[PDB]
Each structure stands twice: as structure tokens, then as C-alpha cells.
Amino acid sequence: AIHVKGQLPNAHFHKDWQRYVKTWFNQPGRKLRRRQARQTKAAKIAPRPVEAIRPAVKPPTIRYNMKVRAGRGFTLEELKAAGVSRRVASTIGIPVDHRRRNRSEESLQRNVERIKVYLAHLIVFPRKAGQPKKGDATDVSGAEQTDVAAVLPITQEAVEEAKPITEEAKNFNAFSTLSNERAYARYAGARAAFQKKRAEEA
Amino acid sequence: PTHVSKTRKLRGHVSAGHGRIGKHRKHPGGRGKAGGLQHLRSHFDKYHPGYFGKVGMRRFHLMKNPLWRPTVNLDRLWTLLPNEARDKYLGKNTEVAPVINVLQSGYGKVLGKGRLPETPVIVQTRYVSRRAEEKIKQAGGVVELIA
Amino acid sequence: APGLVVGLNKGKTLTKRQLPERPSRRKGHLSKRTAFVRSIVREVAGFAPYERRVMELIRNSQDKRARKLAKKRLGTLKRAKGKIEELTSVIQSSRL
RNA sequence: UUGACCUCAAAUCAGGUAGGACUACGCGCUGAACUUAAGCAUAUCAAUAAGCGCAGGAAAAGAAAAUAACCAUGAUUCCCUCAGUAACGGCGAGUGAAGCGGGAAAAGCUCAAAUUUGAAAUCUGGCAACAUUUCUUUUGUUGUCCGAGUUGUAAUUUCAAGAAGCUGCUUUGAGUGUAGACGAUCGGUCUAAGUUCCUUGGAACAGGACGUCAGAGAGGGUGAGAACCCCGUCUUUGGUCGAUUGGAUAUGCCAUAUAAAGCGCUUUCGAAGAGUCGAGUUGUUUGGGAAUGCAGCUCUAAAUGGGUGGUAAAUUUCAUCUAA
RNA sequence: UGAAAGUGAAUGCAGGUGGGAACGCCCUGGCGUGCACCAUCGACCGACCCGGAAGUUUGUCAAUGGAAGGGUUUGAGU
Numbered sequence: 001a002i003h004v005k006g007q008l009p010n011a012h013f014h015k016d017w018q019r020y021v022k023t024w025f026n027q028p029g030r031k032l033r034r035r036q037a038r039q040t041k042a043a044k045i046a047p048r049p050v051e052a053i054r055p056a057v058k059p060p061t062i063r064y065n066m067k068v069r070a071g072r073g074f075t076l077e078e079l080k081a082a083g084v085s086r087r088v089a090s091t092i093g094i095p096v097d098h099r100r101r102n103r104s105e106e107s108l109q110r111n112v113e114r115i116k117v118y119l120a121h122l123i124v125f126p127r128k129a130g131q132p133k134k135g136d137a138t139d140v141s142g143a144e145q146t147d148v149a150a151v152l153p154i155t156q157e158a159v160e161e162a163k164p165i166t167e168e169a170k171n172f173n174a175f176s177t178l179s180n181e182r183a184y185a186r187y188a189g190a191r192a193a194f195q196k197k198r199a200e201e202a
Numbered sequence: 203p204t205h206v207s208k209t210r211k212l213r214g215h216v217s218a219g220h221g222r223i224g225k226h227r228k229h230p231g232g233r234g235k236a237g238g239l240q241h242l243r244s245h246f247d248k249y250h251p252g253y254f255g256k257v258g259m260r261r262f263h264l265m266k267n268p269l270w271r272p273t274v275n276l277d278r279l280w281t282l283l284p285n286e287a288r289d290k291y292l293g294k295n296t297e298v299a300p301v302i303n304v305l306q307s308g309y310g311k312v313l314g315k316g317r318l319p320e321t322p323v324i325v326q327t328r329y330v331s332r333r334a335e336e337k338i339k340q341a342g343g344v345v346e347l348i349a
Numbered sequence: 350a351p352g353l354v355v356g357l358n359k360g361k362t363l364t365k366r367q368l369p370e371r372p373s374r375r376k377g378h379l380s381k382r383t384a385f386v387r388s389i390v391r392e393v394a395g396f397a398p399y400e401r402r403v404m405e406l407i408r409n410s411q412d413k414r415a416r417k418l419a420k421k422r423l424g425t426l427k428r429a430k431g432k433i434e435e436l437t438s439v440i441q442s443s444r445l
Numbered sequence: 446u447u448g449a450c451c452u453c454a455a456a457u458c459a460g461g462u463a464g465g466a467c468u469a470c471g472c473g474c475u476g477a478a479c480u481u482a483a484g485c486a487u488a489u490c491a492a493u494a495a496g497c498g499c500a501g502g503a504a505a506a507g508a509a510a511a512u513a514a515c516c517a518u519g520a521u522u523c524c525c526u527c528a529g530u531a532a533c534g535g536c537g538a539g540u541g542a543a544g545c546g547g548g549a550a551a552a553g554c555u556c557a558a559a560u561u562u563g564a565a566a567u568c569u570g571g572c573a574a575c576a577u578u579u580c581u582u583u584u585g586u587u588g589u590c591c592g593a594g595u596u597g598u599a600a601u602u603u604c605a606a607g608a609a610g611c612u613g614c615u616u617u618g619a620g621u622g623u624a625g626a627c628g629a630u631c632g633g634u635c636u637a638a639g640u641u642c643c644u645u646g647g648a649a650c651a652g653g654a655c656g657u658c659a660g661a662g663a664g665g666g667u668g669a670g671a672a673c674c675c676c677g678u679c680u681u682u683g684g685u686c687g688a689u690u691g692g693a694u695a696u697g698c699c700a701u702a703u704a705a706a707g708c709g710c711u712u713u714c715g716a717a718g719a720g721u722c723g724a725g726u727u728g729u730u731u732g733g734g735a736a737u738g739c740a741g742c743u744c745u746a747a748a749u750g751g752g753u754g755g756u757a758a759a760u761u762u763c764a765u766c767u768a769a
Numbered sequence: 770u771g772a773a774a775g776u777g778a779a780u781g782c783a784g785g786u787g788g789g790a791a792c793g794c795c796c797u798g799g800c801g802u803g804c805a806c807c808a809u810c811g812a813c814c815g816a817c818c819c820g821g822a823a824g825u826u827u828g829u830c831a832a833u834g835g836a837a838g839g840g841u842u843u844g845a846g847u
Contacts, residue, residue, distance in 0.1 A: 002234075003245055012541085014480095014539075016491095034549070052551085057517085058516050058517065060512080060514090060544095060545070061514090061515055061544085062270060062514095066305050072551090100519060103363075103517075106363050159306050162291070162296075162299060163301055178353075181356035182356075232481090236539095237482090237483065238538095254536085260532080260734075262734065275778085313777060332836090348352070348354070349361040360516070371605085373605085373606080374767085377747090378750085380714085384748095424724025424744070
């Protein structure tokens with residue numbers, strides 16, 4: 001039994017696990033299958049890009065909010081600011097995320113510029129060859145299947161370079177402010193209860 | 203390899219390394235950690251103290267994401283900069299001081315272990331310990347708290 | 350506290366925006382047509398037996414036990430109180 | 446007495462459809478015990494085996510009554526990670542997820558609730574025409590009668606909004622031939638070089654000479670180890686002569702855009718799913734702990750209302766989503 | 770490190786003492802120097818038991834805050 005040096009065992013192997021073992025011998029076969037499908041799709045949908053353009057969003061947590069990643073689609077407000085109709089966007093390959101919204105002008109301007117670059121670099125073939133109408137390319141001979149990642153990647157905010165040390169920064173106590181603000185937040189409710197109770201008594 | 207194993211050296215010896223008196227039976231002591239308070243108590247209470255019983259309060263739906271706060275010490279702050287920045291700023295008096303955003307490096311607090319050179323430097327961080335910021339201030343630097 | 354991680358108004362300070370109203374958040378608003386139809390259905394159907402009991406108890410001014418009866422019927426105090434104002438408005442309209 | 450309508454029958458009525466098998470994978474229902482706990486009853490085995498029902502080439506799930514508490518994210522599914530973690534456990538044996546993050550793949554939408562009311566504009570079936578074909582086997586269009594339908598079939602709207610209004614620009618076929626080109630597709634067809642000598646042997650496909658081919662020296666066959674005897678192999682993701690398809694083109698014809706639609710601002714209105722949510726209780730389940738789901742029974746709302754914010758309750762705010 | 774809220778590792782050459790590897794030096798020993806290791810004495814960080822100085826705003830008297838210093842106790846620490 002247990003008489004040897006090391007951890008106490010924890011092997012969750014009391015069910016019939018051998019029936020449900022999963023091996024990965026098809027790992028290269030799955031990898032090759034995905035590529036052939038990927039190459040089939042690219043040839044089927046050419047000249048338009050294989051992967052649609054995605055917005056740049058911020059992950060929702062203190063652990064990841066300092067990074068910039070790709071979202072699902074551009075919000076209705078962003079499209080309206082960029083001048084793209086909601087119906088047209090899905091036709092020319094701009095995903096539309098109705099659920100998302102822009103709480104900050106920083107994110108709105110980020111994605112609005114993103115759409116504007118996409119529109120400037122976009123070549124739209126006429127529905128009937130030879131008659132361009134409104135948004136429509138007059139010359140489509142030079143169209144080629146490129147990558148949106150090459151045209152326009154998701155760029156993280158640049159790390160701020162050196163800046164001078166001000167006197168208002170010199171006379172600033174970081175640790176004291178942190179502890180004071182933590183205590184201020186902690187007793188915010190008790191202070192309000194005291195103030196209201198004193199007010200009714202008065 | 204099986205050609206350098208011990209089952210290849212017990213071919214011919216009857217009991218196969220397990221003895222003639224006690225023998226190699228299935229589970230003479232139980233299966234797993236069973237018996238840690240009755241007959242395995244000598245092993246458990248000598249080599250794994252604390253194993254039985256409850257300690258502390260019970261927290262529901264713990265998420266480690268809002269508790270994420272890796273720490274960096276003071277002596278690793280200058281290592282967080284590129285070598286070109288270090289060669290430009292260490293030991294040379296410049297009107298502009300470098301900014302070391304520890305959040306980008308992946309830390310949530312600046313701790314105070316170690317020393318710093320005599321060059322002012324701006325430390326942008328979420329948290330800072332009491333004497334870590336005191337050492338930075340006495341070294342000429344400043345701590346700017348970010349969100 | 351702003352732009353400080355800790356504090357009361359913690360978090361990075363950005364140029365805030367006015368979010369357009371969601372049509373899905375308009376739900377719960379009493380429409381003119383919905384109000385009119387419910388008035389007709391109330392006038393055609395009437396009141397439930399427990400609604401009659403609560404109304405009678407409130408008329409007798411035993412409001413505390415009327416609330417207890419309503420909570421035991423509906424299931425929550427929130428719903429019990431809501432029925433109390435609904436039936437209180439009904440009786441005042443009837444007396445007027 | 447005739448009729449009308451409702452309801453309910455009958456027919457070897459006209460035309461259809463269901464069963465049964467397979468069940469590796471898929472959706473449920475039902476449901477153990479051996480076993481582990483060194484005994485054993487909770488637990489575990491296991492939401493397993495057996496039993497039952499129902500599908501597809503996948504199924505299921507899926508465009509939030511979703512997370513979160515951020516600088517917020519954004520249908521579902523799967524993978525790695527969270528994580529053997531939070532939690533659950535005679536807190537014993539043992540069990541045990543989720544948010545974020547990275548990736549594979551990405552695609553959105555449809556109704557009910559609205560007076561078409563200056564016109565049921567909708568639909569099945571019979572009959573008669575035309576037409577089309579993986580197809581004399583398929584699939585329809587038009588006309589016209591009977592019928593269904595006002596106890597509501599079309600258009601219109603789906604919360605991401607929208608509808609009514611208001612001026613002002615932009616946009617448009619559910620088409621049908623033809624011709625050739627460019628691709629794809631299963632398939633008939635075509636393929637370089639020793640069997641030259643000597644020895645051994647029943648047999649040369651062996652050994653030894655002399656050579657050849659090679660984008661072919663994979664493999665098989667042939668009387669013993671054959672690149673050169675034969676089928677093949679490489680050329681080939683191709684030539685060929687026959688086929689089927691795809692998206693463009695190059696045109697011809699029918700297209701009644703009086704129309705239909707996107708956008709723009711509105712001092713405006715804005716219908717949003719009920720024995721359902723929810724509550725109590727009882728079983729069963731979960732990692733879900735003063736209940737995570739499901740089900741029975743009892744009680745049963747609402748209208749800025751109702752869900753969810755993972756410690757019961759009351760009140761008050763704040764986010765978030767919009768169920769039946 | 771604590772159950773947590775939370776705090777979060779230099780008096781010193783990153784410290785003394787004893788033994789020490791290797792080297793140097795001197796006439797077998799002696800002197801200097803001490804790696805790794807253990808005995809050990811102290812410092813630092815956290816918990817615990819005290820102790821209440823700034824500062825903060827909010828109740829200033831108070832609320833909040835928790836530095837100095839004290840333990841010679843504690844940790845799977847520096």
C-alpha cells in the first residue's frame with residue numbers, strides 16, 4: 001500500500017476508461033484534411049480574401065485588458081460612422097456584431113479607422129460587368145487574392161517611451177494612495193449609512 | 203526497453219523477487235489511500251501531516267482572473283528594458299527618464315527585493331509595495347500608478 | 350480612484366460615449382393598446398378568488414395579514430406587494 | 446316541409462404516408478449489481494451494462510431570459526488551457542466543472558402579437574393544355590372548375606429593431622436559349638530497355654563476361670535471387686475520344702419597374718409567446734455547497750416587467766439579458 | 770505568507786563564529802585565504818501577540834489609517 005516517498009496518489013481511473021480512450025494517430029491526417037479544405041475554399045471564393053476582416057477589441061478581464069485581440073464583427077455604430085450600410089457590409093465581407101457596443105470613443109475610432117482602411121483598399125466587382133454603380137471599381141483587372149492580415153493586422157498599443165519626471169509626480173505617494181483608496185472603497189457603505197442615520201436624527 | 207529490465211534477470215528465480223513467505227498477493231493492504239486513519243496512520247501522520255480535516259473558509263465560484271497579480275522585484279526592473287534602452291540610460295544623466303511599464307511585461311505588483319542603480323526611472327505599475335516605492339524614490343525614480 | 354485599479358471609481362479613464370438605447374430594453378413598458386386590452390379583459394373576466402380575499406382583507410384594513418395571504422398565494426413578497434398596490438388601486442377606483 | 450351550418454361517421458372512395466432491418470457514431474427514456482471503501486447501510490462503481498423508443502451521414506447544439514465587474518467581451522461546436530482547480534464527499538474511499546486566454550471553423554435568421562379593408566391580394570385538388578428531364582421513370586408553368594380559408598391564407602414587422610409619417614439621392618430578374626473559351630468530374634484508351642554468350646542445374650530467374658534503359662532499380666508473375674521475358678511502375682494533377690457537371694464570358698430573347706428597396710432626420714408611437722415564470726414541497730440529479738438541472742403535486746404573478754450576477758432573508762441601488 | 774481581508778524579503782562585502790576544498794606564502798609544520806557543506810549567532814519578509822506615529826477625509830474630539838519599537842514564539846520563506 002502507501003509506503004513510498006512522494007505525493008499521495010489521485011488517479012481518477014475507477015470508471016471504465018479504456019472504452020473511452022482517445023488516441024491521436026489521425027493528427028497528421030486531420031491536419032492535411034483541413035488544409036485541402038482550406039485550399040478548396042480559397043480557390044472557390046477567389047478573388048475575395050479567404051478570411052474576413054475582424055475588429056480589434058480588448059479582452060474582458062484585468063488579466064488581459066492590456067492586450068488587443070480580434071473581435072467577431074464591427075458594431076452597427078462603427079459601420080454607421082464609417083458610412084457603410086448594415087445590409088451592404090455583410091455583402092462585401094464586413095462582419096456585423098449586433099451584440100457589441102462602443103462604450104468609449106477610443107474603441108470606436110479604432111474600428112472606424114479599421115473599416116476605412118478596408119474600404120480604401122477594397123476592389124468591388126460590378127454586379128453587371130462594365131457598368132460601375134456607386135461603390136464599384138472601374139478597373140478590376142488587377143484584382144488578386146491577398147490576405148487581410150498582410151493588409152491590416154491587429155496592432156497592440158505601443159509601450160510608452162521615456163518621459164520626463166515632473167514635480168507633481170515627485171510629491172506623490174503611491175503606496176499611501178493605494179491603501180487610502182482601498183480603505184475609502186471598503187468603508188464607503190458604512191460612511192453613507194452613518195451620514196444618513198445622522199441626518200435623520202438631526 | 204524490456205531488454206534492460208529486471209523481469210529479464212529474474213527468469214529462473216521462483217518467487218520473482220517478492221519472497222516465499224509473504225508472497226505477492228493482490229491487495230493485502232487495501233486499494234489506494236484507504237486506511238489512512240486505521241492501519242496506514244503511521245505513514246500518514248509521519249509523512250503527510252495535515253491530511254485530514256477542514257481548514258479555513260469556503261469560497262464559491264472562485265475565478266483566478268480577477269486575482270491575477272504576478273510580482274516583480276526591484277533588481278529585475280532594469281532587466282525588463284531592452285538592451286539599447288539600458289545602454290542609453292544607465293549611468294548617464296539625461297533630462298528624460300525611462301518608463302518601465304511592468305504590466306506589459308506581465309506583472310501586477312512591484313516588490314522591494316534588491317537594490318537599484320543611481321539613475322532616475324519611471325515605473326508604471328498597478329501595485330507597489332511600501333519600501334519598493336521608497337527605494338525607487340531614494341534612487342531618484344518615481345512610481346506612476348496605472349489602471 | 351479613477352485610473353488607479355483600486356478605489357471607488359476605479360479603472361482607466363476614456364472618452365465616454367452615449368450608448369444608443371436597445372429596443373430589447375424597452376420591454377416592460379406599458380403600451381396604450383396593451384393597457385386598453387387588459388382593462389377590457391379585467392372588466393370581462395373579473396378577479397381570482399385569492400384576489401377577492403386580499404381585496405376584502407384590505408377593505409377590512411387588516412393590511413398585514415392581507416400581505417401575508419398574498420405572499421402565501423403568489424410566493425414572494427415582491428409579487429405580494431405588487432398585487433397589494435394593484436388591488437389597492439382597484440378598490441380606491443371602485444369607492445370613487 | 447325543404448334547406449343552411451356545426452359535429453360525427455362510412456367507402457376495395459381519389460391521391461398519399463407510417464411500420465421492419467442496420468444501430469460503430471447520434472438524441473432521449475429506463476436502469477442495476479459485481480466492485481472500492483481492507484467490514485458496511487450514504488458514497489463509489491455509474492447519471493455505467495442490460496431493457497425501450499427515434500434519427501442522420503453526421504447527429505446534437507446554435508444566433509443569449511450568455512459572461513462578466515474589464516480599457517469590458519459577444520450564436521453553437523471541437524481542441525489546448527483553465528484544472529485534478531473552485532467545489533462535492535461516513536470532508537472518509539473517492540469525485541470534480543466554468544468564465545477568461547490560444548486555436549480549428551465561421552453565417553445568419555424565421556414566426557405570434559398590426560385594418561389588404563378602395564376590394565383573400567394566399568392555397569390544395571380535378572380536368573385540359575403546353576413544357577421540362579440523371580429519367581418516355583423527373584420537375585413544373587398556364588388556363589379553368591370544385592374546394593380549403595375571414596374562428597385569418599398573402600404582402601408588411603421581429604427588438605439588432607421596426608411601423609407611421611416626412612424630402613432625396615442611390616440601388617434592381619427566382620429570368621430562358623446560343624456559342625465558344627476556361628475548370629472539375631468519374632473512364633475507355635496509349636507507354637523505355639538482353640531473354641546475347643560460357644559454366645552449374647530437371648528448369649537460369651544463379652555465378653562469370655558483354656551490353657541497354659532509367660521521370661521507370663515499387664510490387665507481382667514466370668520451372669531457384671529478373672530494372673531490361675511478362676503484367677506493371679515513372680512520365681500522369683497528361684495525351685487522346687467520348688462524357689458529365691461548375692463559375693464566368695460572348696450574345697439573342699422574354700423581361701409592364703406606375704414598381705420594390707437601402708440610407709436620412711422624427712418632441713412621435715412602438716403590439717413582444719401563461720397552469721408559463723416564480724414559490725413551497727417531494728423524488729431524482731449536479732462540482733453547484735439554506736437546491737445545479739429535471740419531474741410530480743399544491744399555490745400561481747407581472748408590465749420598466751420578468752430572468753441571471755454561484756451563502757438563506759427583507760429593502761434599496763447598479764450592471765446585464767429578453768424566457769415560456 | 771495567512772483561513773481570509775491582505776501585506777510582501779540588504780544595518781553590514783547580502784552578516785559574524787567553528788570545521789573545511791583548492792591555492793598562495795614561510796622555515797615537517799606555520800601564516801594568509803576560504804568554494805560546497807553541515808553546528809551555530811544575528812538581520813529581513815509574512816502570520817500571531819503587543820504597540821498607535823504620520824498621512825487620508827468622513828464623523829476631526831472622531832472616522833479611516835496603520836510607520837517606529839517590542840516578542841526571541843510561528844512558515845512547506847529571503
